Nucleic acid binder design. Structure first.
Ligand SMILES: [Zn+2]
Length: 252
DNA sequence: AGGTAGACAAGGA
DNA sequence: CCTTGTCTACC
């Protein structure tokens, strides 16, 4: 899921689990648990805590319990669902949180790329994986000034800079390409080569792109297809080690 | 040390 | 062979 989908999961999942008390945690693929290292410690510490909240940081879900925060990344194919303990589990269910009311929060993930970390609430933000995470793209903490400061002192391409989680939280490949298209900037351009006007434009389009999605693509996955603005065939190359999509006419 | 590239996760085609 | 973010590892 992208940031906008994670935000939708956050909003939808919260009412389904808030106030519920954990009676058991069952783990069928221990590698998903990254902290505590021992998945049995992870299971044992969550028992008896009640779910109090659910927040989002970039693409991370942060489950707030009594003492602890559970930090969850779905990556590609991770999914949460709430269902009865009486029903057979669906395939690829790797972690189950059982509540005292007989319902369960089930974590499914065909890839098994997702991760979970549990820390005391007050420590979560200063440990991995949340430590060093950049500002929310929809917050005033993400500003043209902040973007310019990073752009100026790097040799990297603008795409690589935007994919840096320390620069801005949760901007993935899709929204970087889309935002760069809307701002008229070639992804392979050196970040330090951007004018102030371009930084401001890029910031504005980044916020619009994310903002619209949370609340139809131009370039991503559309190589060979006509640009929706000028009709020129969309192109695809490799920038910053990844498939990159752009309009060779509209982006400069 | 400090900036930054890519190793790593792992199963489905 | 391929998929993707990111945090550890590298120079
Ligand atoms: Zn175009």
């Amino acid at each position: 899921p992208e940031l906008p989908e994670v935000e939708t999961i956050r909003r939808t999942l919260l009412p389904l689990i808030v106030g519920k008390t954990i009676e058991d945690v069952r783990i069928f693929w221990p590698n998903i648990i990254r902290h505590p290292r021992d998945s049995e410690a992870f299971a044992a510490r969550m028992i008896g805590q009640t779910v109090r909240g659910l927040e989002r940081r970039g693409k991370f879900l942060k489950f707030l319990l009594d003492r602890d925060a559970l930090i969850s990344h779905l990556r590609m194919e991770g999914r949460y669902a709430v269902a009865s303990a009486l029903e057979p589990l669906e395939p690829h269910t790797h972690v189950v949180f059982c509540f005292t009311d007989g319902s369960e929060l089930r974590y499914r993930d065909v890839r098994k790329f997702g991760t979970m970390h549990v820390y005391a609430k007050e420590e979560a933000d200063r440990r991995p994986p949340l430590a060093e995470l950049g500002p929310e793209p929809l917050s005033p903490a993400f500003s043209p000034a902040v973007l310019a400061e990073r752009a100026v002192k790097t040799k990297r391409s603008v795409k690589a800079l935007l994919l840096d989680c320390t620069v801005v939280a949760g901007f993935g490949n899709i929204y970087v390409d889309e935002s760069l298209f809307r701002a008229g900037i070639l992804p392979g351009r050196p970040a330090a080569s951007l004018s102030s006007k371009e930084i401001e434009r890029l910031h504005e389009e980044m916020v619009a792109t994310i903002g619209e999605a949370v609340m139809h693509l131009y370039v991503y996955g559309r190589q060979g297809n006509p640009c929706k603005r000028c009709g020129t065939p969309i192109e695809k190359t490799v920038v910053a080690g990844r498939g990159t999509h752009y309009c060779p006419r509209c982006q400069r």
